[PDB]
Design an enzyme around this catalytic site. Structure first.
Site, PDB file in Angstrom:
ATOM      1  N   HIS F 291       0.806  -1.202   0.000  1.00  0.00           N
ATOM      2  CA  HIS F 291       0.000   0.000   0.000  1.00  0.00           C
ATOM      3  C   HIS F 291       0.847   1.262   0.000  1.00  0.00           C
ATOM      4  O   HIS F 291       0.292   2.363   0.070  1.00  0.00           O
ATOM      5  CB  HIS F 291      -0.951  -0.030   1.198  1.00  0.00           C
ATOM      6  CG  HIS F 291      -1.726  -1.303   1.282  1.00  0.00           C
ATOM      7  ND1 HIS F 291      -1.455  -2.280   2.215  1.00  0.00           N
ATOM      8  CD2 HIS F 291      -2.725  -1.786   0.506  1.00  0.00           C
ATOM      9  CE1 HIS F 291      -2.273  -3.302   2.021  1.00  0.00           C
ATOM     10  NE2 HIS F 291      -3.056  -3.023   0.995  1.00  0.00           N
TER      11      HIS F 291
HETATM   12  S1  FES Z   1       1.692  -0.814   2.979  1.00  0.00           S
HETATM   13 FE1  FES Z   1      -0.010  -1.915   3.870  1.00  0.00          FE
HETATM   14  S2  FES Z   1       0.925  -3.834   4.465  1.00  0.00           S
HETATM   15 FE2  FES Z   1       2.614  -2.461   4.116  1.00  0.00          FE
END
Ligand code: FES
Ligand SMILES: CCCCCCCCCCCCCCCCCC(=O)OC[C@H](COP(=O)([O-])OCC(O)COP(=O)([O-])OC[C@@H](COC(=O)CCCCCCCCCCCCCCCCC)OC(=O)CCCCCCCCCCCCCCCCC)OC(=O)CCCCCCCCCCCCCCCCC
Ligand SMILES: CCCCCCCCCCCCCCCCCC(=O)OC[C@H](COP(=O)([O-])OCC(O)COP(=O)([O-])OC[C@@H](COC(=O)CCCCCCCCCCCCCCCCC)OC(=O)CCCCCCCCCCCCCCCCC)OC(=O)CCCCCCCCCCCCCCCCC
Ligand SMILES: CCCCCCCCCCCCCCCCCC(=O)OC[C@H](COP(=O)([O-])OCC(O)COP(=O)([O-])OC[C@@H](COC(=O)CCCCCCCCCCCCCCCCC)OC(=O)CCCCCCCCCCCCCCCCC)OC(=O)CCCCCCCCCCCCCCCCC
Ligand SMILES: CCCCCCCCCCCCCCCCCC(=O)OC[C@H](COP(=O)([O-])OCC[N+](C)(C)C)OC(=O)CCCCCCCCCCCCCCCCC
Ligand SMILES: CCCCCCCCCCCCCCCCCC(=O)OC[C@H](COP(=O)([O-])OCC[N+](C)(C)C)OC(=O)CCCCCCCCCCCCCCCCC
Ligand SMILES: CCCCCCCC/C=C\CCCCCCCC(=O)OC[C@H](COP(=O)(O)OCCN)OC(=O)CCCCCCC/C=C\CCCCCCCC
Ligand code: HEC
Ligand code: HEM
Ligand code: HEM
Ligand SMILES: COC1=C(OC)C(=O)C(CC=C(C)C)=C(C)C1=O
Ligand SMILES: COC1=C(OC)C(=O)C(CC=C(C)C)=C(C)C1=O
Lengths: 242, 354, 95, 92, 65, 326
Positions: F291
């Protein structure tokens, strides 16, 4: 017919109540297993860490394990890689499955030697007898290629080639390498592998058994005391004696 | 319960003329508690997933696990020795003639014990146990579909172990309850003496009989400790340390030593059901050995010649069971079975008057 | 419990709840008795085991000798069976 | 369940000394067991005569049937019991 | 017990007094159930009937015993 | 009486006692019980010195027949007939129970009937030779048997209480030791097993690492990134050490590293657990691609969805070129 010939009763050191597993022989036994038996057998339930500070020093066990290559994984890409061994790895296995092993021994399966020292009647004696029990076939018995006669194997015909030959290996300690020595030593090692806690069991057993004898003497004096009241009473009916 | 304990342990009067053969029962109760405790503790480190590796993991990785493993196996042998010796005693002194209720309660525990033991050896996931349950389940193969219900599959599998394990966990607790029913009848129906009559020679239990009963139990402990740590006697077959292969049949599919009297019966008789049925006769006929008598006597403290030949019949049948199914052992063993029936008939038959 | 005449109690004091089994084993002593004894603290506690040792083992071995003849017949049968098994195996097999 | 049966050390006749294996003309140590084979065969002569007799009886049979395994297993068990009593005295 | 001339004889007399005596047929002004004597009071409660129809302590002394 | 049963049945094979008595049926009858001879004041049979001189016994060894275990007894439970066999009391046969009531053996010619039946009270019959044979014991300890008189210690003996309580105490001493050992070893088995302890603590050899290299060690199931940090990496985190309080999770590099050259961290994104990849992101630290969380060269969250900094495991330095995780 009769059951397979009973193995002779060999005078191993550890058979006495107050005796241990002879570490010098167990060390030589590891060498025999690694250089002879391991080609076809596996010891799945024997790990390198079991030998640390018991048969070999920690650094030495690291070197032994690192000599082998194991398949670990997956990596971050989901792939399997090969790494040197560690103290937490089981002893290497020559074949990937039982079907691969069978295909390399004329259909016969080399049994895992982890508990074989206690998986046959005779126990350790059965290993020593078997390895030294190969003979020329009895008259009237003819064995195909890859079948060898052995007096202690059930039936007489074993698919294992006679494994121990004089000079097959050189013992690090200089002990003369003869077939009967290798047998005595690999039998010792496999016995240890079956139950590595054999020495703790027998040292704690010694302290329990001796203590139990002292305990028997205390409860006996107690029993003799209280029952004197009963066993020396005198009940009279028409008589009186003081 | 303290008053109950005082009434049944501290102010319990027993005859002062009893031998050390009246201490066997105390030992059963103590060794039974030990088998439950050790069993519950072993289960803390192993379950039903793969017993073969689990037993290895107990003896090699758990601290002092070897003690738990070997106590639980050897104390079973001990349980069955003391129980079988407790029956031999009860037969010798004919303690079933007037205390049948005690005898009935005991037999119930014997039946429960015979199921507890058989199923414990399949928990080890060994070859000789795999192929010995496959051969005893196929005796009820006549009752349609019953094998499938018990096994849970068409061959013995983990499914069979997951269910027998629950019977092995729970049935021992019920046995302990029947032990209370047994001690209840013993305390109401007073114990039998070494003499046939009833005499005013009773002494309290805690101050005398418990001291003597402990001298006995500590004597047995000395011997059990030697077996527990040095295997002076082979009481466990080695072929249970071979991983289960469903294709290869073991060299000999025999039970443990304390089922060799009913294994031989099953291997001697020529029809499978006849064997099963003669194994029922052995555990059932012994419960009516005084019912047809009509004389005012308990047939006690005679030479007990019939008793001696019965005890030897048991030992001899256990020997035949160890031996392979050779024809000569089968013929001789069939004669030993015929002889048992005649000895049993002698116990059962009332006597006519000259 | 004992016979109803034996367990019949002379006293009218109620049976204590902790002594129920004790008083169900009561005997009505006929003619009386004079019971005597000495505390184990003022006696030899191991001598009697030695004093009775020879007679105990004599009267035990004389009774156990009753089983000698039965024992010998059973051992004769054990030897006959053993030899029969061996000869039968050597006959079926063993050229 | 276990490899061996325990015994008192006075019942376990362990070698009290060590005799090194003989060395061959080449210089390779000769197996103590191989040297003990003839001596132990003589101690089991009675069974060996039985086996040798069988061999000659099966040799006569004009069919191809006949084995002497039964008598060989008795001889071998005897020769091996003899070896067990004295072999570990030549082994470290 | 103790001889007449023992230094502990008066102590044994007092201990004899503490034990005291009790008869169900002559209980006195204080009933057994409410007696200051501990032996009497506990005894009078046993089974709601009393476990001592009669009892008395005794202290007998001789020249050397 | 408790649930009980008596075999009072009409047998098909065995006769009642009234028909075939099994006892030696010779009795002496008296008019009143007092007229019986007194056993205690009656001379007994002369004593013998050899067991082969002991008198013969009136019992019949073969009183009972048929299949069955041998027994000698005088009595049975079998029911008696409505019209029992008349006993021959003239010759000494016993008349008791059914063979008196349901028979006329008691009738005399001219005697009053009340007197005749009185003589047949069961108390007026005793076996012949009763007073000359019944043992009348005066003690339970016959002469020549050991009793308290012989076992009493001499009056000069030492107190035997101190040693008795040593023996009962030694039974308690040894018992309590066995109990302690049993309990202590059972609880000890609950300690992490030998295999579990070995994997738990992991020694990591820092010899051979090069500055800037990141390696991963699986410790207690989780990826543990162990990165040697170049001076540039160390200086970078030190620069952000001044801008602390401008970070989502304010932490100083000194409090996240025991030695500046070495960063040991658990490589688990604090957002949703994905494992970050090193030398990625805007800070050249560790970028989680799931993410988009960016961590710096100290493992502190600098951008993305992640809420906290990557955790620092429990680890000490054994020497300069070895760490021990755990
Ligand atoms: S950016 Fe969400 S699990 Fe690492
Ligand atoms: C043969 C004998 C057969 C009969 C045995 C006795 C039977 C009997 O009535 O006892 C029942 C017994 C009651 O006996 P009892 O008469 O009432 O008295 C009991 C005591 O008084 C109770 O006494 P206590 O209250 O004080 O408790 C203590 C008691 C607790 O124990 C008991 O209660 C004992 C129970 C009976 C045990 C019988 C053991 C017999 C062992 C014989 C061994 C011979 C070895 C020969 C070796 C030769 C080597 C070349 O211990 C003893 O009494 C021990 C006594 C001695 C035992 C035997 C010792 C033998 C020593 C031999 C030494 C030889 C040295 C040679 C040197 C040479 C040098 C040159 O209890 C029962 O009813 C059941 C008990 C459970 C076991 C029953 C077993 C029955 C079957 C036996 C089979 C034997 C093997 C097979 C033979 C046949 C093969 C084909
Ligand atoms: C390798 C060798 C193998 C040998 C195998 C065969 C061995 C047989 C041994 C026993 C028989 C010996 C010969 C008997 C000749 C006839 C005797 C007779 O009529 O007796 C009347 C006679 C009555 O005279 P008593 O003196 O007034 O009796 C006083 C008693 O106190 C009575 O007290 P109570 O007044 O309270 O009465 C209790 C009541 C208690 O009675 C009951 O509980 C009645 C119910 C059970 C028995 C009767 C029915 C059994 C089932 C029959 C089949 C039903 C099929 C239904 C089909 C339906 C289809 C829709 O009993 C009686 O009243 C008397 C009868 C006693 C029970 C036995 C009756 C049958 C005798 C034959 C037995 C089987 C022989 C098989 C032969 C096979 C080929 C060789 O009894 C006796 O002589 C005394 C009893 C002797 C027998 C004891 C049997 C013990 C129980 C086990 C029997 C089987 C043992 C062997 C099994 C082996 C393999 C498992
Ligand atoms: C309050 C403070 C207390 C401090 C205590 C410290 C001591 C202590 O506990 O340390 C333990 C520590 C040793 O611990 P350890 O090594 O674990 O113990 C020995 C082993 O455990 C023992 O070896 P093991 O455990 O490996 O052995 C097996 C064990 C346990 O075995 C088992 O449990 C195995 C079986 C397990 C079964 C598991 C499954 C169970 C299943 C259920 C069964 C149900 C039944 O059983 C036995 O060993 C049996 C022993 C029986 C007795 C032996 C002796 C017999 C003597 C006979 C005398 C009578 C005959 C005389 C004849 C004379 C003829 C002339 O003690 C010592 O080092 C000893 C010296 C202690 C000195 C203490 C000094 C205190 C100073 C205080 C100073 C304070 C200053 C304060 C200043 C400021 C003030 C304001
Ligand atoms: C062509 C050739 C033909 C040959 C045919 C040959 C047939 C031979 C058949 C023989 C059968 C003999 C059976 C005897 C059984 C006796 C059972 C008995 O005693 O019953 C006890 C019991 C009760 O018997 P009871 O109540 O009468 O009491 C008997 C008690 N005694 C002996 C003391 C008098 O029987 C039953 O309860 C009946 C059970 C069956 C329904
Ligand atoms: C196979 C299973 C495992 C086997 C190995 C492990 C076995 C473990 C067994 C443990 C048993 C422990 C029993 C401890 C008993 C300690 C107390 C005791 O009885 O001491 C005597 C004493 C009795 O002593 P006493 O009755 O002489 O009392 C006299 C007291 N004085 C001296 C003060 C006047 O018992 C007690 O202390 C009371 C509790 C019992
Ligand atoms: C009774 C004996 C039962 C068995 C006891 C046992 O196993 O003892 C172990 C061991 C035997 O070891 P081995 O290997 O045979 O050694 C031979 C010489 N090196 O025995 C001993 O150490 C000596 C015997 C036990 C002494 C006990 C002393 C304490 C108890 C005294 C009670 C009073
Ligand atoms: C190194 C010295 C050893 C040891 C200690 C053992 N072997 Fe072998 N073995 C091989 C095969 C194919 C079998 C199975 C054959 C079959 O039984 O038909 C075996 C069997 C064993 C056993 C088990 C015997 C039993 O009754 O099952 C044991 C204890 C054993 N071996 C020990 C094959 C080989 C080899 C292939 C060439 C080699 C090398 C070894 N074995 C070496 C050893
Ligand atoms: C789980 C197994 C059992 C245990 C716990 C046990 C326990 C005991 C106990 C504690 C006693 C009293 C003490 C004694 O006299 O020894 C006793 C008595 C008795 N038991 Fe058991 N028992 C068991 C098995 C059996 C079996 C299988 C039978 C029947 C074959 C049996 C029949 C009897 C009899 C008849 C008595 C009374 C003996 C006499 O009259 O005193 N018991 N038992
Ligand atoms: C009458 C009491 C009991 C007896 C006779 C009995 C019998 C035995 C037997 C013979 C074994 C096989 C041991 C071996 O593999 O050789 C076994 C295994 C086992 N028993 Fe029991 N048992 C008893 C009660 C219990 C109880 C109450 C538990 C606890 C739930 C238990 C737990 C186990 C477990 C986990 C095993 C498998 C581990 C093992 O192989 O040792 N047992 N039992
Ligand atoms: C492998 O385990 C067992 C057997 O194997 C053959 C038995 O025979 C028996 C005996 C079985 C019956 C039906 C009498 C038992 C109980 C047993 O445990
Ligand atoms: C019928 O139940 C059995 C007994 O009790 C009577 C035994 O005694 C025996 C024999 C026991 C020993 C110790 C030889 C066995 C095995 C048996 O099955």
């Amino acid at each position: 017919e009769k059951d397979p010939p009973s193995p002779p009763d060999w005078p191993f050191w550890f058979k006495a109540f107050s005796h241990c597993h002879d570490i010098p022989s167990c060390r030589r036994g590891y060498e025999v297993y690694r250089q002879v038996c391991a080609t076809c057998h596996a010891a799945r339930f024997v790990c390198f860490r079991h030998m640390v500070n018991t048969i070999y020093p920690e650094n030495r066990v690291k070197q032994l394990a690192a000599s082998f290559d194991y398949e670990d994984g997956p990596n971050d890409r989901g792939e399997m890689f090969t790494r040197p061994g560690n103290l937490l790895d089981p002893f290497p296995s020559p074949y990937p499955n039982e079907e691969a092993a069978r295909f390399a021994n004329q259909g016969a399966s080399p049994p895992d030697l982890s508990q074989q020292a206690a998986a046959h009647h005779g126990g350790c004696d059965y290993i020593m007898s078997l390895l030294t029990g190969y003979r020329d076939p009895p008259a009237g018995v003819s064995l195909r290629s890859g079948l060898y006669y052995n007096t202690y194997f059930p039936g007489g015909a074993i698919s294992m080639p006679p494994p121990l030959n004089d000079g097959a290996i050189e013992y690090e300690d200089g002990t003369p390498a003869v077939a009967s020595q290798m047998a005595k030593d690999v039998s010792q090692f496999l016995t240890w592998a079956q139950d590595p806690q054999h020495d703790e069991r027998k040292l704690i057993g010694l302290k329990m058994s001796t203590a139990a004898l002292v305990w028997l003497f205390s409860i006996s004096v107690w029993n003799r005391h209280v029952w004197t009241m009963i066993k020396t009473r005198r009940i009279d009916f028409t008589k009186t004696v003081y | 319960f303290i008053l109950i304990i005082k009434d049944n342990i501290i102010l319990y009067n027993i005859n002062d003329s009893i031998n050390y053969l009246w201490n066997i029962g105390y030992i059963i109760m103590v060794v039974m508690i030990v088998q439950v405790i050790t069993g519950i503790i072993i289960n803390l480190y192993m379950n039903i997933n793969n017993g073969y590796k689990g037993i290895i993991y107990i003896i090699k990785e758990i601290y002092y696990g070897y003690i738990l493993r070997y106590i639980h196996n050897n104390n079973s042998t001990l349980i069955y020795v003391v129980v079988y010796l407790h029956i031999i005693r009860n037969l010798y002194y004919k303690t079933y003639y007037y205390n049948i209720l005690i005898w009935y309660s005991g037999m119930i525990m014997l039946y429960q014990l015979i199921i507890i033991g058989f199923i414990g050896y399949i928990l080890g996931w060994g070859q000789l146990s795999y192929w010995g349950i496959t051969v005893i389940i196929n005796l009820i193969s006549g009752i349609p579909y019953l094998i499938l219900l018990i096994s849970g599959n068409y061959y013995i599998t983990i499914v069979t172990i997951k269910r027998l394990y629950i019977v092995h966990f729970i049935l021992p607790i019920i046995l302990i309850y029947v032990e209370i029913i047994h001690v209840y009848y013993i305390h109401y129906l007073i114990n039998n003496n070494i003499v046939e009559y009833n005499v005013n020679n009773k002494i309290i239990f805690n101050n005398y009989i418990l001291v003597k009963d402990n001298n006995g139990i500590i004597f047995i402990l000395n011997i059990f400790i030697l077996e527990l740590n040095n295997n002076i006697f082979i009481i466990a077959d080695n072929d249970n340390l071979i991983e289960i292969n469903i294709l290869v049949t073991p060299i000999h599919i025999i039970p443990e030593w304390y089922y060799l009297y009913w294994y031989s019966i099953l291997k001697l008789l020529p029809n499978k059901y006849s064997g099963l049925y003669i194994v029922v006769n052995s555990i059932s006929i012994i419960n009516i050995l005084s019912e047809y008598k009509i004389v005012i006597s308990e047939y006690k403290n005679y030479k007990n010649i019939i008793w001696y030949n019965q005890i030897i019949q048991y030992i001899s049948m256990i020997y035949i069971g160890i031996q392979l199914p050779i024809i000569e052992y089968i013929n001789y063993g069939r004669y030993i079975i015929i002889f048992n029936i005649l000895l049993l008939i002698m116990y059962l038959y009332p006597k006519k008057k000259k | 419990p004992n016979t109803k005449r034996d367990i019949r109690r002379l006293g009218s004091y109620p049976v204590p709840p902790e002594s129920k089994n004790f008083w169900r084993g009561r005997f009505q002593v006929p003619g009386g008795q004079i019971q005597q004894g000495v505390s184990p603290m003022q006696q030899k506690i191991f001598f009697q085991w030695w004093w009775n040792l020879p007679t105990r083992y004599f009267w035990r071995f004389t009774k156990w000798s009753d089983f000698l003849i039965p024992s010998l017949m059973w051992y004769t049968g054990f030897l006959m069976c053993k030899n029969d098994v061996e000869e039968g195996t050597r006959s079926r097999y063993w050229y | 369940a276990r490899a061996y049966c325990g015994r008192f050390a006075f019942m376990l006749d362990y070698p009290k000394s060590y005799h090194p294996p003989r060395k061959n003309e080449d210089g390779d140590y000769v197996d103590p067991r191989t040297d003990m084979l003839p001596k132990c065969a003589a101690e089991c002569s009675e069974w060996l005569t039985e086996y040798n007799a069988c061999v000659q009886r099966i040799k006569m049979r004009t069919d191809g049937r006949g084995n002497c395994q039964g008598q060989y297993e008795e001889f071998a068990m005897c020769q091996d019991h003899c070896i067990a009593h004295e072999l570990f005295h030549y082994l470290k | 017990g103790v001889p007449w001339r023992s230094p502990d004889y008066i102590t044994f007399m007092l201990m004899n007094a503490i034990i005291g005596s009790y008869d169900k047929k002559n209980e006195g002004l204080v009933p057994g159930l409410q007696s200051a004597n501990r032996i009497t009071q506990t005894g009078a409660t046993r089974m709601d009937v009393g476990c001592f129809d009669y009892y008395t302590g005794f202290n007998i002394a001789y020249k050397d015993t | 009486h408790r649930p009980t049963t008596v075999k009072m049945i009409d047998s098909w094979r065995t006769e009642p006692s009234s028909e075939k008595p099994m006892w030696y049926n010779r009795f002496d009858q008296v008019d009143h019980i007092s007229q019986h001879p007194d056993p205690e004041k009656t001379e007994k049979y002369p004593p013998v010195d050899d067991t082969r001189k002991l008198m013969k016994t009136r019992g019949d060894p073969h009183i009972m027949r048929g299949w069955g275990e041998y027994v000698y007894c005088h009595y049975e439970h079998l029911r008696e007939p409505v019209f029992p066999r008349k006993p021959d009391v003239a010759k000494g046969e016993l008349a008791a129970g059914a063979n008196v009531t349901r028979t006329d053996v008691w009738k005399r010619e001219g005697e009053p009937a009340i007197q005749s039946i009185a003589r047949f009270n069961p108390d007026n019959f005793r076996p012949v030779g009763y007073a000359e044979n019944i043992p009348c014991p005066d003690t339970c300890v016959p002469e020549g048997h050991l009793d308290f008189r012989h076992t009493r210690l001499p009056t000069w003996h030492a107190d035997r209480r101190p040693f008795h309580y040593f023996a009962t105490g030694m039974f308690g001493l040894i018992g309590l030791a066995f109990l302690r050992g049993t309990v202590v070893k059972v609880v000890h088995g609950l300690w992490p097993a030998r295999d579990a302890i070995a994997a738990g603590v992991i020694e990591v050899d820092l010899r051979g690492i090069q500055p800037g290299q990141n390696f991963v060690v699986k410790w207690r199931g989780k990826p543990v990134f162990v990165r040697r940090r170049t001076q540039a990496m160390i200086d970078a985190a030190t620069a952000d050490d001044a801008i602390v309080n401008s970070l989502r999770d304010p932490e100083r590099d000194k409090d996240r590293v025991k030695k500046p050259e070495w960063l040991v961290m658990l490589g688990v994104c604090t957002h949703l657990g994905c494992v970050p990849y090193p030398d990625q992101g805007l800070y050249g630290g560790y970028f989680c691609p799931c993410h988009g969380s960016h961590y710096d060269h100290s493992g502190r969250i600098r951008l993305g969805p992640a809420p906290l900094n990557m955790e620092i495991p429990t680890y000490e330095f054994t020497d300069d070129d070895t760490i021990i995780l755990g």
